[PDB]
Short mmCIF file of C-alpha atoms in Angstrom, two decimals:
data_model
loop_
_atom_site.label_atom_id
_atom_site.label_comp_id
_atom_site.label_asym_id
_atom_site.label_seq_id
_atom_site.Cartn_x
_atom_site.Cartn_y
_atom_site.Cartn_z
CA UNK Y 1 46.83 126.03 91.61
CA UNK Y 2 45.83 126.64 95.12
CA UNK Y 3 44.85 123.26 94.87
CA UNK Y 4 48.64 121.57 94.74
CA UNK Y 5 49.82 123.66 97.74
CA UNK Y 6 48.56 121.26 100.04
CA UNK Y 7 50.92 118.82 99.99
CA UNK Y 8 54.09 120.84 101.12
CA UNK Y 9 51.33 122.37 103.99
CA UNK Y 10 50.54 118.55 104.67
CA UNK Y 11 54.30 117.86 105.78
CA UNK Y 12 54.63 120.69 107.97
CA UNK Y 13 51.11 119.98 109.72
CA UNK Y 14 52.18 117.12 111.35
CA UNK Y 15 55.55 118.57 112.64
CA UNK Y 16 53.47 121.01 114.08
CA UNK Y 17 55.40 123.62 111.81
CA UNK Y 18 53.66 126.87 110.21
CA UNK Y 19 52.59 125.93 107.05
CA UNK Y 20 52.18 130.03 106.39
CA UNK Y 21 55.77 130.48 107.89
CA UNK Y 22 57.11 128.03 105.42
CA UNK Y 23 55.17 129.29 102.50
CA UNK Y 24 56.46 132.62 102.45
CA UNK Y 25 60.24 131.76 102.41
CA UNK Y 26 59.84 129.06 99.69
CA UNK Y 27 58.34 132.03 97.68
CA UNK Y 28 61.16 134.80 98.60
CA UNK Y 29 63.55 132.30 97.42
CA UNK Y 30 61.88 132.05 93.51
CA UNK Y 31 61.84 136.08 93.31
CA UNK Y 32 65.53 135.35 93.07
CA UNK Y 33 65.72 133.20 90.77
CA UNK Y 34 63.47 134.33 88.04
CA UNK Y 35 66.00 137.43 87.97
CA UNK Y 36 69.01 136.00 87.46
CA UNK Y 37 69.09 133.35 84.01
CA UNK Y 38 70.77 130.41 86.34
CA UNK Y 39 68.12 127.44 87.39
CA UNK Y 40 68.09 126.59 91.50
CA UNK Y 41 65.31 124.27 92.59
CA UNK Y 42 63.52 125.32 96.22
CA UNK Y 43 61.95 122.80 98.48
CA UNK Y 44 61.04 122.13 101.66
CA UNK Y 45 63.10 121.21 104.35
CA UNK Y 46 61.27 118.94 107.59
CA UNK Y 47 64.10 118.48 109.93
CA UNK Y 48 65.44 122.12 109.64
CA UNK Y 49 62.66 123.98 109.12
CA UNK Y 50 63.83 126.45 106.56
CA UNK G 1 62.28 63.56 99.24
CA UNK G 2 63.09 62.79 102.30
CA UNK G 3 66.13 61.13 103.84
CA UNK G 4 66.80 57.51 105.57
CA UNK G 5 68.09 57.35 108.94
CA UNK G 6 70.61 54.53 107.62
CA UNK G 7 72.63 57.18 105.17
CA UNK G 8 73.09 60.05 107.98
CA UNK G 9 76.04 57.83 109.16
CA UNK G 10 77.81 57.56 105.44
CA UNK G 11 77.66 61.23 104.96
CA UNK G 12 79.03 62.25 108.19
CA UNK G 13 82.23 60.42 107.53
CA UNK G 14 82.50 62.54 103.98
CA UNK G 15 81.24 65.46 105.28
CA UNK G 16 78.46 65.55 102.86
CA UNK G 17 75.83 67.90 103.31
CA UNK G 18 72.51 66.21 102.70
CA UNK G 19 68.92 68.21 102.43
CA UNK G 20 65.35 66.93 102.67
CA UNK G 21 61.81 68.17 101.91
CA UNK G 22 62.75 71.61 99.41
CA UNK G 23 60.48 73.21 97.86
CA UNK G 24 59.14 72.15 93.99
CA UNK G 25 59.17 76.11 93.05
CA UNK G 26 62.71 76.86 94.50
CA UNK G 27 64.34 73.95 92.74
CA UNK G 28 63.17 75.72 89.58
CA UNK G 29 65.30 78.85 90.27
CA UNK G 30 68.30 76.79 91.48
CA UNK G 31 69.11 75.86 87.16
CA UNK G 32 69.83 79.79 87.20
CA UNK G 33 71.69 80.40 90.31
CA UNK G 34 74.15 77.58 90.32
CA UNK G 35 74.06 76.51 86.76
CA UNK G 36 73.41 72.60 87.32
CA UNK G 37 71.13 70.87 85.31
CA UNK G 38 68.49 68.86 87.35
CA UNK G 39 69.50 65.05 86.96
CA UNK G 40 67.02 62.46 87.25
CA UNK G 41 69.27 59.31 86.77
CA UNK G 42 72.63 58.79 88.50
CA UNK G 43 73.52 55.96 85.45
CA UNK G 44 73.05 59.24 82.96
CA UNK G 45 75.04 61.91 85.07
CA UNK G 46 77.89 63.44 83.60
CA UNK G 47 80.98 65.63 85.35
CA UNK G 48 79.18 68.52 83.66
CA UNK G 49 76.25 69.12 85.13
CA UNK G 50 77.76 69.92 88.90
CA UNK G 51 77.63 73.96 88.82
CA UNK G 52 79.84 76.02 91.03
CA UNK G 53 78.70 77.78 94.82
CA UNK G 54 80.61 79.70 97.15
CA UNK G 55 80.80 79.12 100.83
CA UNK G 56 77.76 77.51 102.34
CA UNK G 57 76.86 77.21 105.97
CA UNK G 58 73.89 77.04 107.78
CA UNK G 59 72.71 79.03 111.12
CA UNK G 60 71.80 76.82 113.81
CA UNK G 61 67.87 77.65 115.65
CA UNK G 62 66.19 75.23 117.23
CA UNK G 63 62.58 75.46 115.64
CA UNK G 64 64.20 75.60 111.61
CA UNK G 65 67.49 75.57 109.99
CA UNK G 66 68.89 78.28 106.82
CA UNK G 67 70.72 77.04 104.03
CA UNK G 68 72.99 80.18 102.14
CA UNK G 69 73.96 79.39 98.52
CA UNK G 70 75.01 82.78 98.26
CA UNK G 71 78.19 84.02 96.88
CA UNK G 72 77.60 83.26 93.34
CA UNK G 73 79.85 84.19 90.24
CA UNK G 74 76.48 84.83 88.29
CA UNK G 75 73.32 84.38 90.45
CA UNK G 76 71.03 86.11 88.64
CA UNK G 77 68.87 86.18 91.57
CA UNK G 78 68.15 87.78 94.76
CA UNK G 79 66.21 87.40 98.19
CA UNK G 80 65.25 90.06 100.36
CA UNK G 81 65.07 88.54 104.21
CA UNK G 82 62.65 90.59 106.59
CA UNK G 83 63.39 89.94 110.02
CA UNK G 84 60.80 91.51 112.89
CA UNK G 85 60.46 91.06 116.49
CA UNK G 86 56.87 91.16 116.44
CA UNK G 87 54.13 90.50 113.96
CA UNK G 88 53.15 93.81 112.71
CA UNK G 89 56.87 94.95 112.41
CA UNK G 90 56.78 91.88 109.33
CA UNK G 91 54.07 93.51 107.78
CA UNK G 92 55.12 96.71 107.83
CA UNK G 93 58.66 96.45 106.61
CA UNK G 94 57.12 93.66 103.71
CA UNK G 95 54.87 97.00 102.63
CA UNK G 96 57.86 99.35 103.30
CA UNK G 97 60.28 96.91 100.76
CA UNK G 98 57.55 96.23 98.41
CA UNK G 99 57.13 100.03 97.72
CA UNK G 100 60.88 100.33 97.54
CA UNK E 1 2.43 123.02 88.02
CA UNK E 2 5.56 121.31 89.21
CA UNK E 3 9.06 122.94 88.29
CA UNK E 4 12.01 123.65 89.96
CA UNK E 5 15.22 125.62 90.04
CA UNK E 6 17.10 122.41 90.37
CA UNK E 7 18.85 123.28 93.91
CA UNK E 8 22.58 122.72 94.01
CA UNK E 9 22.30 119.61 96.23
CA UNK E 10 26.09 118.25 96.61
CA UNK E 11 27.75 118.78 99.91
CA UNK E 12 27.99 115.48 101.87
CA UNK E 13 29.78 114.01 98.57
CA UNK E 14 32.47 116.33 99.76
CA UNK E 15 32.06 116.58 103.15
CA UNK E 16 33.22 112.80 102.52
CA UNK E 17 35.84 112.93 101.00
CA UNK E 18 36.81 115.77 103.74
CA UNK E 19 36.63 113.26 106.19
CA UNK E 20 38.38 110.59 104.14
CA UNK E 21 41.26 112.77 103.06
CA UNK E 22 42.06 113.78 107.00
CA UNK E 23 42.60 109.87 106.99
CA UNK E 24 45.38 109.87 104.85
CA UNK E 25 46.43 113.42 105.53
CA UNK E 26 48.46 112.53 108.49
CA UNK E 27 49.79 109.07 106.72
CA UNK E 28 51.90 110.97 104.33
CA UNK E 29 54.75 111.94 104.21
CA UNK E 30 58.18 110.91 105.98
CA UNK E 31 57.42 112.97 109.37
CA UNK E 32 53.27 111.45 109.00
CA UNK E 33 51.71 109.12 112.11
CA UNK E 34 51.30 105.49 111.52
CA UNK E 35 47.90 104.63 112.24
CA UNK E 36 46.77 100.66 113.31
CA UNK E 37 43.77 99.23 111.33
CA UNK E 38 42.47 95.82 112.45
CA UNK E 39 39.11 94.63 110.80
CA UNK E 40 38.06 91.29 112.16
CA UNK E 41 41.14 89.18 111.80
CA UNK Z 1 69.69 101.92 145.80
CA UNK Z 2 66.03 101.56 146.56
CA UNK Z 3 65.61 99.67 150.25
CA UNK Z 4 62.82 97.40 150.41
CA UNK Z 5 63.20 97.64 154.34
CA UNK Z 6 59.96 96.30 156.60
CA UNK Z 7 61.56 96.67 159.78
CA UNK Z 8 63.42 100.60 160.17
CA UNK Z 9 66.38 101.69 158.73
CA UNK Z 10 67.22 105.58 158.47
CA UNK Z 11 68.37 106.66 155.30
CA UNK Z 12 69.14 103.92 152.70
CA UNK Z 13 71.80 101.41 152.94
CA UNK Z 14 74.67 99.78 150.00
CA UNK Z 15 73.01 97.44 147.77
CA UNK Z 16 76.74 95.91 147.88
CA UNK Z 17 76.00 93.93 150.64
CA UNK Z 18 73.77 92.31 149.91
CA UNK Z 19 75.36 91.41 146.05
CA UNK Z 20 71.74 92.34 144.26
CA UNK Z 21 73.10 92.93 140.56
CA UNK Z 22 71.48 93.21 137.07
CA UNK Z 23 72.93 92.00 133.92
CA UNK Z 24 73.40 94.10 130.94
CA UNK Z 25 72.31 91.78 128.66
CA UNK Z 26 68.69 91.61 130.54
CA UNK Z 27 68.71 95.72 130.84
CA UNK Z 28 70.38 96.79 127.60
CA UNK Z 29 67.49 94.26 125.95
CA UNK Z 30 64.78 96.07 127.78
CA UNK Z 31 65.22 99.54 126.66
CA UNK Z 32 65.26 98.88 123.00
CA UNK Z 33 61.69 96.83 123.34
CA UNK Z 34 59.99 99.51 126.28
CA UNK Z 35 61.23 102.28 123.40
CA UNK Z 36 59.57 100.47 120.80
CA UNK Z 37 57.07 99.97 122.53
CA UNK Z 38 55.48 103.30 123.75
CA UNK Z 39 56.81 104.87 119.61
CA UNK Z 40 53.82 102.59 118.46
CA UNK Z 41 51.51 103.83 121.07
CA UNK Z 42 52.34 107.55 120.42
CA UNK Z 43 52.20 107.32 116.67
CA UNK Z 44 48.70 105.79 116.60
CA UNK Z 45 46.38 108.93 116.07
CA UNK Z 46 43.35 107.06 114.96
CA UNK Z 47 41.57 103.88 115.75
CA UNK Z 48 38.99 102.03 113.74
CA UNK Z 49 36.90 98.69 115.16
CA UNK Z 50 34.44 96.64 113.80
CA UNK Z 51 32.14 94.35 115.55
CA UNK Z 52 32.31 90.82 115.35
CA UNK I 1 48.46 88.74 129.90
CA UNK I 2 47.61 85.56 127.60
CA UNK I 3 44.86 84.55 130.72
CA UNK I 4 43.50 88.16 130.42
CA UNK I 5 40.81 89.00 128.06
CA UNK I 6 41.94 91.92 125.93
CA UNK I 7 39.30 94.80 124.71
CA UNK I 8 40.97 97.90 123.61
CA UNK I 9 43.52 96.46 120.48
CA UNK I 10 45.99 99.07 121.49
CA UNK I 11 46.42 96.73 125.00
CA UNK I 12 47.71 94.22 122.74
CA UNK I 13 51.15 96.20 121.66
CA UNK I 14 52.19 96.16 125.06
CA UNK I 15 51.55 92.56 125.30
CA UNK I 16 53.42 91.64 122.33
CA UNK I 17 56.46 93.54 123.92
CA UNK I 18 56.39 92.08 127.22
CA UNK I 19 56.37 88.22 125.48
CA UNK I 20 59.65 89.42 123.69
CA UNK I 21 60.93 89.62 127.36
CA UNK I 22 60.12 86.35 128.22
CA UNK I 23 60.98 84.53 124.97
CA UNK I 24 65.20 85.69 124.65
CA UNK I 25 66.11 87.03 127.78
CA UNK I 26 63.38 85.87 129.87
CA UNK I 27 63.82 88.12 132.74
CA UNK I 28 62.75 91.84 133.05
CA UNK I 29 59.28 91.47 131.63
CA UNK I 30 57.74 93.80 134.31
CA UNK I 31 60.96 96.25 133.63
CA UNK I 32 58.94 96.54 130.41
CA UNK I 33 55.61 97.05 130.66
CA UNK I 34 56.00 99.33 133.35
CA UNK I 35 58.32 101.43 131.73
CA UNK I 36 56.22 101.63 128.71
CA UNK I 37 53.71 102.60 131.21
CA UNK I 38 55.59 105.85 132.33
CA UNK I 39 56.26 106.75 128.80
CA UNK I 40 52.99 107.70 128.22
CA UNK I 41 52.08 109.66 131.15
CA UNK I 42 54.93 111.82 130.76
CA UNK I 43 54.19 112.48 126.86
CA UNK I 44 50.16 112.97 128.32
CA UNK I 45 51.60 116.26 129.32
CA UNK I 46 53.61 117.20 126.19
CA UNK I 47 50.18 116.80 124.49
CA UNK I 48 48.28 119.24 126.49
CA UNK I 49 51.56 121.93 126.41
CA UNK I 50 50.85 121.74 122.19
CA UNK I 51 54.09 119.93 121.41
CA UNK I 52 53.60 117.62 118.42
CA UNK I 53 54.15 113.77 118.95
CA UNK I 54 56.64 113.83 115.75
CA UNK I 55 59.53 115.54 117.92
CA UNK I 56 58.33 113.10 120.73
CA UNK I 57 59.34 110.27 118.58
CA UNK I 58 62.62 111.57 117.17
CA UNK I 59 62.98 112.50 121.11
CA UNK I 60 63.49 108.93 122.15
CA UNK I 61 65.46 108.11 119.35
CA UNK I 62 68.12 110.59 120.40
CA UNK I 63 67.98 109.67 123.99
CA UNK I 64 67.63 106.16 123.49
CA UNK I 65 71.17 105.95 121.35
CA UNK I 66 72.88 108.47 124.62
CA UNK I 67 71.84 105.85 127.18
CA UNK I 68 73.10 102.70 125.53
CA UNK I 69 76.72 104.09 125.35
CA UNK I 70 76.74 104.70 128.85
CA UNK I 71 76.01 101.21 129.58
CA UNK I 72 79.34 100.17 128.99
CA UNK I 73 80.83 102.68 131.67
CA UNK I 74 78.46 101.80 133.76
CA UNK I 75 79.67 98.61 134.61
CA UNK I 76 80.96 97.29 137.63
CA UNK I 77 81.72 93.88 138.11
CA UNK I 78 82.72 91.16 135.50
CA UNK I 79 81.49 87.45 135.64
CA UNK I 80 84.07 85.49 134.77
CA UNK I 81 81.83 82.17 134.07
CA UNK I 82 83.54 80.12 136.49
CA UNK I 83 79.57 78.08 137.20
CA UNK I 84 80.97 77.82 140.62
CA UNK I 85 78.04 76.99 143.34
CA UNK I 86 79.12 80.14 145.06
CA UNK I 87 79.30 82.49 142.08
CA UNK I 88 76.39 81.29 141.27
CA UNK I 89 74.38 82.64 143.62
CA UNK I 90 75.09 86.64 142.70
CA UNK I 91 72.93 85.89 139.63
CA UNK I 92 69.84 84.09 141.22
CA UNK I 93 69.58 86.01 144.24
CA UNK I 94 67.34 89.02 142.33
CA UNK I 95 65.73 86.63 140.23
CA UNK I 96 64.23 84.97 143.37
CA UNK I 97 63.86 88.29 145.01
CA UNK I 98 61.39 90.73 144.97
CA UNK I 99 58.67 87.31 143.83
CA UNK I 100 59.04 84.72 147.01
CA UNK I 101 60.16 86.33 150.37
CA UNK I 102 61.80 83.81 152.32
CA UNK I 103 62.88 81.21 150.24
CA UNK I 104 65.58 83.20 148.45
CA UNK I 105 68.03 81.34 150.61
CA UNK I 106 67.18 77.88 150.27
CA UNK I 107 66.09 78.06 146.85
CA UNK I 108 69.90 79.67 146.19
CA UNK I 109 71.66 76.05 146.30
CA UNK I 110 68.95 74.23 145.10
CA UNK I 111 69.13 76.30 141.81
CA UNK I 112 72.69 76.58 141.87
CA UNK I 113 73.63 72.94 142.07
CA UNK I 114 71.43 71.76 139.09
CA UNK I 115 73.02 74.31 136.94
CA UNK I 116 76.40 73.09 137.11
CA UNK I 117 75.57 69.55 136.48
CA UNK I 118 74.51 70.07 133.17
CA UNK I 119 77.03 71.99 131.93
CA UNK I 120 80.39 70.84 131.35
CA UNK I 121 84.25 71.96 132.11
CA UNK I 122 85.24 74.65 129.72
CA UNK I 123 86.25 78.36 129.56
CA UNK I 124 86.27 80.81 127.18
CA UNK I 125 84.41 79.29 124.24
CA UNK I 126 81.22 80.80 122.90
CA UNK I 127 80.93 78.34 119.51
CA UNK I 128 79.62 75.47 120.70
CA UNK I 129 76.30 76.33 122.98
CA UNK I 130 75.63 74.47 126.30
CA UNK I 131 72.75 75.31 128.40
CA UNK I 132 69.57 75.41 126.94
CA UNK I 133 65.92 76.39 128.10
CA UNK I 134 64.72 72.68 128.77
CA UNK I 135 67.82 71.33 130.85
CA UNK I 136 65.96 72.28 134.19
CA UNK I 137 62.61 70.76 134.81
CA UNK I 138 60.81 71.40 137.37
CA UNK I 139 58.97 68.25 139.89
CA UNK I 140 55.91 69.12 142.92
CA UNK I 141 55.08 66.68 145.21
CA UNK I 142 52.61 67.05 148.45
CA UNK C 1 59.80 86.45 113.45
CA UNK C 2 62.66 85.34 115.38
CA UNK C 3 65.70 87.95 114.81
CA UNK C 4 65.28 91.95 115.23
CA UNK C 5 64.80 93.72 112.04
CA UNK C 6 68.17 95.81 112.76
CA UNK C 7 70.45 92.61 112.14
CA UNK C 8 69.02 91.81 109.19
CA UNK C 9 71.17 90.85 105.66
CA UNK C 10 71.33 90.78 101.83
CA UNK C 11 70.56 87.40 100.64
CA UNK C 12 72.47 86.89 96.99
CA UNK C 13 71.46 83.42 96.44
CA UNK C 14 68.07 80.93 97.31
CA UNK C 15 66.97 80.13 101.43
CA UNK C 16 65.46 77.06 101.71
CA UNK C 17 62.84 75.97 104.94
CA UNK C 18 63.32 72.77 105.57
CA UNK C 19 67.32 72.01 105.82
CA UNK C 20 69.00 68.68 106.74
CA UNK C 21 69.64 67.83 110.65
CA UNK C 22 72.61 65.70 111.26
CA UNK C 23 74.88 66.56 114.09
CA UNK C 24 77.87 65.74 112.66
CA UNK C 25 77.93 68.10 109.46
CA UNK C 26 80.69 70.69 109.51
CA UNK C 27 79.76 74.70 110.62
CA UNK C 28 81.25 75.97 107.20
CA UNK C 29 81.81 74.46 103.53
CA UNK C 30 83.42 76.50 101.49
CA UNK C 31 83.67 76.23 97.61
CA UNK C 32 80.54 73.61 97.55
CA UNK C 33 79.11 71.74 94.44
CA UNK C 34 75.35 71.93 93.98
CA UNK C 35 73.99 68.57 92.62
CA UNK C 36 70.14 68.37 91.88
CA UNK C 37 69.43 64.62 92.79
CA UNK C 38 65.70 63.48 91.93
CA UNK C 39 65.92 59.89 93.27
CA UNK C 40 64.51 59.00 96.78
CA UNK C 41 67.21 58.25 98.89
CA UNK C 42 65.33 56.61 101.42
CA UNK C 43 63.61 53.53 102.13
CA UNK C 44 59.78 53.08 100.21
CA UNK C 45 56.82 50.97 101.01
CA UNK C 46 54.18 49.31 99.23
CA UNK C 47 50.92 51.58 98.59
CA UNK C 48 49.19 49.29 101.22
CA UNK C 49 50.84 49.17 104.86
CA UNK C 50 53.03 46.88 105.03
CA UNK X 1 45.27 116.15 130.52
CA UNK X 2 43.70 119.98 130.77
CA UNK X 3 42.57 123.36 129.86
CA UNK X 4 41.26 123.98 126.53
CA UNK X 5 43.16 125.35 123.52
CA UNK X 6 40.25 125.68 121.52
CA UNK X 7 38.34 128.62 120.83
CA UNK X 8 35.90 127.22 117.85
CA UNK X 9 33.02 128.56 119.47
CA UNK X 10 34.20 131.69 117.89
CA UNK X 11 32.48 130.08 114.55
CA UNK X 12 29.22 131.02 116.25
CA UNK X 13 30.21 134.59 116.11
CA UNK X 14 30.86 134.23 112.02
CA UNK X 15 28.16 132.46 111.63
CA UNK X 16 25.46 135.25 113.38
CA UNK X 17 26.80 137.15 110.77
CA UNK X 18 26.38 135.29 107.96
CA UNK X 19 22.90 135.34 108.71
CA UNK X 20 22.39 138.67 108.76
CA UNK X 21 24.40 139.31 105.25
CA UNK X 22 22.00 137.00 103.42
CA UNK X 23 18.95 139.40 104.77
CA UNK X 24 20.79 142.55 104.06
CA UNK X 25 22.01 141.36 100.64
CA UNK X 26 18.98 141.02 98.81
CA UNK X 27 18.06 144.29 99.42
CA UNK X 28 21.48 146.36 98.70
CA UNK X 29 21.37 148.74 95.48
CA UNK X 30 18.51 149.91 93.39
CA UNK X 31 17.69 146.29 92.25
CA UNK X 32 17.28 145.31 95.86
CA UNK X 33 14.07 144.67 97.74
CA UNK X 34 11.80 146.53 99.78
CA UNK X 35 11.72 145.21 103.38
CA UNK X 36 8.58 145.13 105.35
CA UNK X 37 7.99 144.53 109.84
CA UNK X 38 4.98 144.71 111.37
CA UNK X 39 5.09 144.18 115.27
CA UNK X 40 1.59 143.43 115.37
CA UNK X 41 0.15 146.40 116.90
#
C-alpha cells in the first residue's frame, strides 16, 4: 500500500511541491466522502497545487 | 516510371498533372483512398475505373515537392505529418504521436 | 565442520534498481525533465 | 540606443540618424529559436556518454 | 561552429539553433547564441535560491507569448518594397555593420544595385516568389 | 525537417516524395480524377547502351 | 553557483547511533548478555 503512493509523490517532486503537504489534503478530502453515500473522485492537481 | 522530357509540353497545354517515381507500397493504398482500380493497359480501360478526389495542389520547396489527395468522400485512410525544426524535435514528437 | 546461517546477502540488487528508478523518476509525469541520451550514433 | 563611439561623445546619441533598423521578421524569428533553445538546456538533468 | 570540434553533446543544441538562423532568415545568428547564453546564467542563480527548473520552463513560456504581442506596437517604420537603390540601403547598412568597419559605404551601392536587377517591376504581390538565395554570387580577384 | 512543428496539419489522404516538376502546371486543381497508369511514358533503351 | 543547502552529514550523527543500539541491544532484558571490558591493567 505504501508502496503505490509514490507515484502522486513522484509528480509533485519535480515541481518542487511538498509531497507531505499534498498528501494530507488528498486524505481530508476522502473522510468526506466515505460519510456521505454520494461517490466524488480526489486527485491531484500540478498546476494549482491543491 | 519516370517521365519524357518530350510529353511535359502536351500536358501543359491540358493542364494535366503528371507524377514520376511513386512509391510501389503507396500505390497499394491509393485502390482504397480514391477507389480506382490500377490499369495496366490503356486498350482495356474503361470510364469506370477513374475514382473521385477533391482539390489537389501541391506546395512549392525547392529541395522536394507534396502532392495532397486529401479531401476524400471515403478515404479510409490517414497520415499523420511531423514537422520539426531540428532533428531531435522529429524524434521526439514521432515517440510523443506513437504513444498517442 | 562447514555450516552456515545462510547470511541475507541482497542489497546491491536493490541498491540498483534504486539507482535505476531515480532515472525514470524524474521522466514521468507531465511536469517530469526530459533527459538527452546519445550512445555512439 | 547602444553607441559604438571610438572617438568621444557624452551621453548617447539617436540611432535615427544614422537609419540602423532591424526587421521583425529577423527578431520575431530569433526569440522563438533562443527560447527553445535554452528550455532544452534547462530540462536536461542527466547526461550519459559512452566512449567510442 | 561546423569548423569547431565539439566535446560536451550538450554544445551541440546550441549549434543546431544557431544553423536555424542561418538557413530561413539568415541574419541574427549571433542574436541567438548569445541570448541563449544569458539564459542560463540568469537561471544559474534560480538554481542555487532552490527554485525548481519546472516553473523556469513554464516561466518563458508565459513571457515569451507577452513579448511577441508587443512586437507589433513596437513598430516604427514600414517598408513599402519600392527596391529603390536608395531604400535599399536602410536594410544593408546593419548587415554590413558591426562585421567590416569601413566599407559599409561602398559596399552600400554595390549591394544595392545587384539587387534590383534581378528582380522585376511589381508591387503588392506575394504569390509568385522572386528573389532567391542563389541570384547573388559572389567573384574575388587580386 | 524543414517547417516548425507549430504549423503543422492533418493529412486525410496519401503524400507522395517524389512529385512531378513542370513549370507550367496550375497552383490548384480542384475536383481531380485519379488514374493509376502502369505503362512507361517515356522513352526506353535496349539492355545494352545504345 | 554557492553556499550549500545540504546538511547530509547529519547521517553521520544517525549513524553513531546505530552503532551503539546494536551493542546495547543484545544485552537488554533477562535474555540479554553479560558484557565484559578489561582496560588492560
Amino acid at each position: 500500500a505504501e508502496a503505490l503512493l509514490v507515484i502522486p509523490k513522484t509528480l509533485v517532486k519535480n515541481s518542487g511541491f511538498d509531497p507531505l503537504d499534498v498528501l494530507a489534503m488528498v486524505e481530508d478530502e476522502l473522510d468526506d466522502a466515505q460519510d456521505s453515500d454520494e461517490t466524488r473522485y480526489v486527485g491531484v492537481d500540478l498546476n494549482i497545487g491543491d | 516510371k519516370g517521365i519524357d522530357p518530350m510529353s511535359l509540353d502536351v500536358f501543359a497545354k491540358h493542364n494535366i498533372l503528371a507524377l514520376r517515381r511513386a512509391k510501389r507500397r503507396n500505390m497499394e493504398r491509393l485502390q482504397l483512398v480514391t477507389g480506382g482500380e490500377a490499369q495496366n493497359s490503356v486498350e482495356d480501360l474503361s470510364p469506370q475505373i477513374l475514382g473521385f478526389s477533391g482539390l489537389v495542389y501541391q506546395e512549392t520547396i525547392g529541395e522536394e515537392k507534396f502532392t495532397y489527395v486529401t479531401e476524400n468522400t471515403d478515404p479510409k485512410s490517414c497520415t499523420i505529418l511531423i514537422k520539426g525544426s531540428t532533428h531531435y524535435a522529429l524524434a521526439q514528437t514521432k515517440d510523443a504521436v506513437r504513444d498517442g | 565442520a562447514e555450516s552456515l546461517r545462510r547470511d541475507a546477502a541482497l542489497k546491491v540488487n536493490v541498491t540498483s534498481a534504486e539507482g535505476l528508478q531515480s532515472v525514470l523518476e524524474t521522466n514521468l509525469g507531465p511536469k517530469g525533465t526530459l533527459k538527452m541520451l546519445v550512445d555512439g550514433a | 540606443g547602444v553607441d559604438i563611439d571610438g572617438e568621444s561623445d557624452e551621453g548617447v546619441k539617436d540611432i535615427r540618424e544614422e537609419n540602423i533598423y532591424d526587421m521583425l521578421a529577423t527578431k520575431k524569428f530569433a526569440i522563438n529559436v533562443a527560447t527553445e533553445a535554452a528550455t532544452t538546456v534547462l530540462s536536461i538533468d542527466q547526461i550519459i556518454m559512452a566512449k567510442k | 561552429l561546423r569548423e569547431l570540434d565539439i566535446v560536451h553533446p550538450a554544445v551541440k543544441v546550441l549549434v543546431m539553433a544557431t544553423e536555424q538562423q542561418k538557413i530561413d532568415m539568415g541574419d541574427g545568428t549571433n542574436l541567438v547564441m548569445i541570448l541563449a547564453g544569458e539564459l542560463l546564467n540568469v537561471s544559474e542563480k534560480l538554481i542555487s535560491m532552490g527554485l525548481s527548473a519546472v516553473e523556469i520552463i513554464q516561466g518563458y513560456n508565459m513571457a515569451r507569448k507577452f513579448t511577441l504581442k508587443e512586437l507589433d506596437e513596437m513598430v516604427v517604420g514600414e517598408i513599402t518594397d519600392k527596391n529603390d537603390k536608395n531604400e535599399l540601403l536602410k536594410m544593408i547598412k546593419p548587415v554590413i555593420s558591426s562585421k567590416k568597419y569601413g566599407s559599409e559605404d561602398i559596399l552600400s551601392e554595390l549591394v544595392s544595385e545587384a539587387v534590383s536587377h534581378v528582380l522585376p517591376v511589381a508591387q503588392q504581390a506575394g504569390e509568385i516568389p522572386y528573389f532567391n538565395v542563389d541570384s547573388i554570387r559572389v567573384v574575388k580577384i587580386m | 525537417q524543414h517547417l516548425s512543428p507549430k504549423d503543422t496539419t492533418f493529412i486525410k489522404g496519401l503524400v507522395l516524395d517524389h512529385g512531378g516538376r513542370h513549370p507550367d502546371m496550375p497552383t490548384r486543381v480542384k475536383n481531380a480524377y485519379v488514374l493509376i497508369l502502369n505503362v512507361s511514358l517515356e522513352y526506353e533503351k535496349t539492355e545494352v547502351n545504345s
